[PDB]
Amino acid sequence: REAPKVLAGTGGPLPESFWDPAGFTNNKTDEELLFYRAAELKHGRIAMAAVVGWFTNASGFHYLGDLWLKKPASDNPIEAFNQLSLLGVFQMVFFIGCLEWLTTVPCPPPKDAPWDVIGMSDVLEEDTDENPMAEYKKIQMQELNNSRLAMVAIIGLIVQATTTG
Amino acid sequence: KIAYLQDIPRTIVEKDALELILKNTPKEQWENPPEDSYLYTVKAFAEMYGPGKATKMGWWDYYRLKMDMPDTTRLSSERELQEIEEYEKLMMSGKVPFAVPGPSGYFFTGFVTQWKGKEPFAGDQVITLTENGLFAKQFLSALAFYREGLKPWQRGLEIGMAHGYFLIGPFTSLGPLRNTPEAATVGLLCGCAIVGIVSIGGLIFGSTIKPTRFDKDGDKPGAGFIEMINWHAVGGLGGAGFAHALITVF
Amino acid sequence: ELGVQAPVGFWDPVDGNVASFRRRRTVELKHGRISMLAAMGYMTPEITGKFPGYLSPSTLLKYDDIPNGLGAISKVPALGWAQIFVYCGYAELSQDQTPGSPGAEGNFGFKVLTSSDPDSLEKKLASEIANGRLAMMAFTGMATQDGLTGSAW
Amino acid sequence: FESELGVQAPTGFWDPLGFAKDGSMKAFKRRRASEIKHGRIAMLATMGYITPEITGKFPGYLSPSTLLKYDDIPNGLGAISKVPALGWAQIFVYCGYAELSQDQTPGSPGAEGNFGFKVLTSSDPDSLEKKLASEIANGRLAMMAFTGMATQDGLTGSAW
Amino acid sequence: FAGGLTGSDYGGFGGKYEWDPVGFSTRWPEHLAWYREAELKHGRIAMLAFAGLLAPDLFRLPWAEFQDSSLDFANAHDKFVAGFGPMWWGFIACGGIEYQRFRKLGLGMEGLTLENAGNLGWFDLPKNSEERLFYETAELKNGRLAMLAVSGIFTAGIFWDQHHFPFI
Numbered sequence: 001r002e003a004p005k006v007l008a009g010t011g012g013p014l015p016e017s018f019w020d021p022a023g024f025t026n027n028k029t030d031e032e033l034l035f036y037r038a039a040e041l042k043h044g045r046i047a048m049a050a051v052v053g054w055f056t057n058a059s060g061f062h063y064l065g066d067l068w069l070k071k072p073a074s075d076n077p078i079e080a081f082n083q084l085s086l087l088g089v090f091q092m093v094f095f096i097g098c099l100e101w102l103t104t105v106p107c108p109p110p111k112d113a114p115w116d117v118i119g120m121s122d123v124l125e126e127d128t129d130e131n132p133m134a135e136y137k138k139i140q141m142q143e144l145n146n147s148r149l150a151m152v153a154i155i156g157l158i159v160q161a162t163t164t165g
Numbered sequence: 166k167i168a169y170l171q172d173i174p175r176t177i178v179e180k181d182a183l184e185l186i187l188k189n190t191p192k193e194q195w196e197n198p199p200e201d202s203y204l205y206t207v208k209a210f211a212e213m214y215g216p217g218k219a220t221k222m223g224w225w226d227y228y229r230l231k232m233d234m235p236d237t238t239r240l241s242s243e244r245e246l247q248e249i250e251e252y253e254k255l256m257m258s259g260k261v262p263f264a265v266p267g268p269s270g271y272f273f274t275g276f277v278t279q280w281k282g283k284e285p286f287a288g289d290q291v292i293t294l295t296e297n298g299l300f301a302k303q304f305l306s307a308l309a310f311y312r313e314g315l316k317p318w319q320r321g322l323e324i325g326m327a328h329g330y331f332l333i334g335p336f337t338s339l340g341p342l343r344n345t346p347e348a349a350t351v352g353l354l355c356g357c358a359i360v361g362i363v364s365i366g367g368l369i370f371g372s373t374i375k376p377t378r379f380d381k382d383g384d385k386p387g388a389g390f391i392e393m394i395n396w397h398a399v400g401g402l403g404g405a406g407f408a409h410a411l412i413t414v415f
Numbered sequence: 416e417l418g419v420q421a422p423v424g425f426w427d428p429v430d431g432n433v434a435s436f437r438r439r440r441t442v443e444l445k446h447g448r449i450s451m452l453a454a455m456g457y458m459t460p461e462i463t464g465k466f467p468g469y470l471s472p473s474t475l476l477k478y479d480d481i482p483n484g485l486g487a488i489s490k491v492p493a494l495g496w497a498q499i500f501v502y503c504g505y506a507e508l509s510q511d512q513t514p515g516s517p518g519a520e521g522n523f524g525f526k527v528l529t530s531s532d533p534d535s536l537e538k539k540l541a542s543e544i545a546n547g548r549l550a551m552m553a554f555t556g557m558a559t560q561d562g563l564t565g566s567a568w
Numbered sequence: 569f570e571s572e573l574g575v576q577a578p579t580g581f582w583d584p585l586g587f588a589k590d591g592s593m594k595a596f597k598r599r600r601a602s603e604i605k606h607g608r609i610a611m612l613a614t615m616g617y618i619t620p621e622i623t624g625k626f627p628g629y630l631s632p633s634t635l636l637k638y639d640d641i642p643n644g645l646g647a648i649s650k651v652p653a654l655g656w657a658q659i660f661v662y663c664g665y666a667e668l669s670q671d672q673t674p675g676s677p678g679a680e681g682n683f684g685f686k687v688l689t690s691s692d693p694d695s696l697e698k699k700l701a702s703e704i705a706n707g708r709l710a711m712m713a714f715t716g717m718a719t720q721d722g723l724t725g726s727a728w
Numbered sequence: 729f730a731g732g733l734t735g736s737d738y739g740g741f742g743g744k745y746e747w748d749p750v751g752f753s754t755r756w757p758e759h760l761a762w763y764r765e766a767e768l769k770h771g772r773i774a775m776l777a778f779a780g781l782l783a784p785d786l787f788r789l790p791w792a793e794f795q796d797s798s799l800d801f802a803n804a805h806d807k808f809v810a811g812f813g814p815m816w817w818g819f820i821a822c823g824g825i826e827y828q829r830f831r832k833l834g835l836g837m838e839g840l841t842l843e844n845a846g847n848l849g850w851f852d853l854p855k856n857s858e859e860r861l862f863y864e865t866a867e868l869k870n871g872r873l874a875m876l877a878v879s880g881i882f883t884a885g886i887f888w889d890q891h892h893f894p895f896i
């Protein structure tokens with residue numbers, strides 16, 4: 001593999017199965033593969049929060065949005081987005097814009113691990129041999145596998161909602 | 166080998182249970198088990214009951230013996246012993262298996278954060294994620310108080326703008342005149358007053374402690390801090406006025 | 416080698432290489448398998464009937480209400496054929512041709528060839544591809560029959 | 569870059585807006601891959617309108633469950649709402665693979681318009697540039713023809 | 729693990745599974761012959777049981793006492809055994825077959841070992857030596873599945889009152 005070894009033992013059904021049934025990674029360089037993972041984790045981390053946000057909003061808990069609209073917004077998260085006051089949406093975009101600015105320009109993640117937006121690499125070990133720790137690779141699997149599931153899950157929610165209610 | 170650990174009857178203790186005891190017990194304690202250690206009872210009985218010794222016991226004595234020996238389930242297995250022998254090694258090596266408090270407890274995050282800092286005996290150099298992580302370090306360094314290349318008046322102006330813009334809100338809303346037709350000029354005045362009071366406090370600090378980390382070379386000590394505080398007052402005025410202007414216009 | 420047959424040679428009046436033939440071979444075997452599944456698959460809603468039944472999504476106790484060779488739909492089993500389409504993709508993305516080192520070898524999960532009866536190479540590999548070619552024409556000819564010449568039988 | 573397959577003859581290096589004063593060497597191939605892909609789609613798109621006009625609509629049923637004789641679906645804009653979303657999904661899926669096939673990632677053989685069709689592979693008779701330049705030039709014509717055709721079908725109302 | 733028994737090996741994404749998470753093999757190694765014999769005989773009967781519940785729904789035996797409706801899988805047992813009936817015809821038949829197994833392995837089943845277990849000697853389809861290994865695992869994997877399947881069939885069918893192939 002050579003370059004895909006930098007993201008090795010971190011995907012597939014079982015943790016050490018480089019899936020890629022399209023050749024999207026072969027012939028690509030090490031930095032490109034790392035950047036591809038940075039896109040994957042960022043999508044998945046947002047997808048995990050997106051699914052959680054979808055469920056806490058599709059059950060009837062839209063306080064900020066019921067207290068701002070002075071009426072219980074519809075449970076359907078897609079329809080509740082329209083009812084949500086335009087001031088709320090613009091502030092929501094701005095807050096994420098500040099976070100995206102903050103991570104990129106002032107506090108950039110490293111170039112070898114462009115997904116360390118919190119930056120554990122300066123205090124983490126990741127290469128020791130203890131059992132009651134050094135399971136960081138396993139928790140990387142749980143983040144990726146859960147996030148990948150959340151990505152297809154949230155799309156299913158949006159596609160079904162926008163079509164078959 | 167050790168005398169009393171040979172040819173011990175299975176009735177006194179089973180073979181697998183005895184091996185588990187010997188594994189759990191440290192090697193140096195086999196010869197003379199201490200006291201109150203299952204191996205101590207094994208020695209004190211296997212030296213009385215065996216092939217060449219008393220081969221029978223009263224039913225009650227055997228019943229009490231069977232309740233002094235381990236029941237094959239209260240002993241740590243090899244993997245548990247490895248868990249302990251490696252957890253203690255991590256803890257003594259200055260590395261902590263990272264854990265995060267939860268609902269009356271903590272979840273192990275499966276990460277080895279090196280705990281002791283560069284000065285291992287220093288108490289405030291124990292590196293944590295929230296202060297010594299890459300994001301935390303770059304966020305603290307990029308604050309107006311710490312940002313490289315900023316003139317002292319620029320730091321003061323930025324901090325003052327933030328403070329003045331924020332301080333208007335708590336007064337213009339839920340204030341004594343929160344329901345009056347103006348209800349915001351009062352908040353503007355109160356926010357400017359708070360900015361002035363904290364600026365006066367900063368001037369007291371700079372004329373008493375006199376920090377010299379912002380002074381350029383060959384200047385009156387504390388001049389950089391005083392300039393920062395004066396421009397914080399100016400920035401607080403500006404931010405308060407800007408927040409008031411936004412509230413009135415919009 | 417492999418699918419070279421007996422009644423004809425390389426039958427290439429148009430690939431004719433190594434790497435390009437390998438990809439074409441993967442297409443050939445793949446199309447062969449589906450036709451054989453489809454050909455025997457089409458004869459079954461015929462004699463033995465529209466065998467299905469049991470509690471299905473919007474098709475509870477559906478006796479395979481998708482009639483005719485095309486299957487039609489109308490929320491009858493053919494909508495459930497999309498589940499066949501989806502799960503067909505799962506096998507097409509897990510046991511696929513990108514890690515399929517030979518032409519169309521899936522590592523023989525069933526191990527039918529581990530002396531259960533099929534054999535490696537020789538006639539069996541040639542018999543699979545030749546049978547696939549016959550079924551592909553048969554399935555296409557069966558498609559013409561349903562369209563403008565009645566039904567299958 | 570001033571010597572690729574795009575410079576035909578009637579116009580030279582036609583970059584009035586200066587995308588090449590800063591166009592990196594890989595950016596050319598990326599934009600060339602965009603141009604080749606755009607042109608090939610336009611040729612397929614154009615055929616897809618002029619051919620159902622002269623040749624009648626498909627003899628068939630399109631959707632075996634929702635009575636689409638291909639005649640209730642007009643040739644032009646508005647057919648997007650007439651063709652089923654699944655027939656739309658299935659063409660989306662088919663086009664989805666055609667790029668999730670052998671990769672067109674930067675530097676890959678798929679990134680310069682090469683995919684393995686080889687319908688017209690002349691035996692290198694100084695014609696590899698001819699077929700390449702013709703495909704690019706026709707794609708440029710097809711894109712312009714389509715946009716006019718799209719405006720023809722829209723502004724008039726239907727077809728042409 | 730468990731002698732050379734073929735329960736593990738050729739068992740999924742991993743080559744070998746070796747699922748004995750109580751130690752009933754290591755704790756009782758003298759019974760690995762008995763356990764295989766029981767495991768196989770359970771699988772074969774369960775497979776005939778599941779394929780059973782379905783076929784009476786279409787064809788019925790010409791015994792002319794079984795040739796009656798309403799004999800589903802919740803009443804066929806208590807109905808056929810009479811004041812004797814068809815159930816004794818089946819039980820006597822199972823006695824005839826089971827007696828044959830005694831002759832091959834002795835009265836006390838002393839000849840029962842970890843290689844002859846569940847091997848009555850009926851060899852018509854199998855060929856070669858590696859296929860026998862492959863088929864033996866294919867036997868068990870089908871057999872173990874049907875043992876859980878008929879278990880779900882019997883419980884779900886009689887609890888939810890299904891009594892037919894969907895068993896729902």
Ligand code: CLA
Binds near residue numbers: 007009012149151
């Ligand atoms: C934002 C999407 C995204 C991105 C950028 C990545 C990126 C990556 N994945 Mg990944 N993955 C994702 C989503 C994503 N993933 C989801 C949702 C799943 C669940 C099925 C997976 C499951 C998965 C496995 C099982 C494995 C990877 C692996 C990898 C790495 C190898 C590169 C690769 O596979 O192609 C990178 C490029 C892409 C993924 C392109 C995105 C997809 C294109 C645009 C077409 C898809 C469009 C789609 C058909 C239509 C959208 C709707 C759809 C939901 C129906 C790379 C870091 C491998 C790895 O690192 O293991 C060591 C590996 O084994 N992924």
Ligand code: CLA
Binds near residue numbers: 574576582601606
């Ligand atoms: C997707 C469209 C597209 C793209 C990506 C390219 C890309 C390219 N062309 Mg190209 N071309 C196109 C369409 C396109 N072309 C069309 C339609 C024509 C016919 C007029 C041409 C004619 C042409 C010639 C004659 C030559 C090129 C060349 C080139 C290459 C270098 C020039 C460059 O950087 O162009 C970059 C192109 C773009 C960035 C496209 C931007 C288009 C802008 C945004 C809009 C233009 C107006 C538009 C028609 C408005 C439509 C109205 C609508 C809103 C209603 C590059 C690979 C040259 C070459 O190969 O050099 C070696 C060369 O000699 N092209």
Ligand code: KC1
Binds near residue numbers: 738740741742869
């Ligand atoms: C929730 C209930 C449950 C079911 C229903 C189930 C089902 C099957 N498991 Mg399974 N399993 C767990 C639970 C369940 N498993 C758990 C908690 C663990 C963690 C200890 C675990 C681990 C393994 C491993 C390591 C293997 C394995 C196997 C199979 C197998 C055989 C298929 C085939 O070979 O025919 C089938 C049908 C083998 C394998 O082949 O998996 C495909 C094998 O190697 N399992």
Ligand SMILES: CC1=C(/C=C/C(C)=C/C=C/C(C)=C/C=C/C=C(C)/C=C/C=C(C)/C=C/C2=C(C)CCCC2(C)C)C(C)(C)CCC1
Binds near residue numbers: 326399400402403404
């Ligand atoms: C809640 C939240 C949070 C926090 C946030 C914050 C903290 C915010 C802040 C904010 C702020 C705090 C802002 C501020 C701003 C300010 C401004 C914007 C200002 C401006 C000013 C100006 C502009 C001025 C000017 C002037 C001067 C300088 C002087 C003269 C006069 C004048 C006026 C000209 C977190 C993240 C934790 C999480 C969750 C969410």
